[PDB]
Amino acid sequence: DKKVIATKVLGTVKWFNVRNGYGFINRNDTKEDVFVHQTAIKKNNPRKYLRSVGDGETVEFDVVEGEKGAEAANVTGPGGVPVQGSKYAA
DNA sequence: AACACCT
Asked: Rounded distance, CA A37 to CA A52, Å?
């Protein structure tokens, strides 16, 4: 019964640290930060062994209401393009 | 899952 706050929504990655294992994405439609995790990334750069999201890179994802706040899921690049990811990515 | 720093 998980509620989906939003669907395919374009946003911008404020910053994502590979070492930390977590990061935040700033939605350009709501200007509100959302929780994001590597396991929440459906598609990513194939050249990267570890899933990651590039900083300053526009991303597309669905917003799902979370207990701690909005949660991002199925994060992919625009037009189905794979996420570039971060350089720190393995 | 509740906040930035790493090769």
From this structure: 8
How far is residue A66's CA from residue A60's CA, in Å, rounded to a whole number?
18
Three-state secondary-structure class, residue A39: helix
- What the block records as the tokens of A12 is 């911008």
The CATH code of the domain that includes A25 is 2.40.50.140
Q: Which of residues 15-54 of A touch strand B (CB under 7 A)?
A: 15-20, 22, 24, 33, 35, 37
Please give the nucleotide, over all strands, whose C1' is closest to the CA of residue A39: B1
Question: Solving technique for this entry?
Answer: NMR
| Residue A32 domain-assigned (yes or no) | yes
Domain enclosing residue A17, as ranges: 4-80
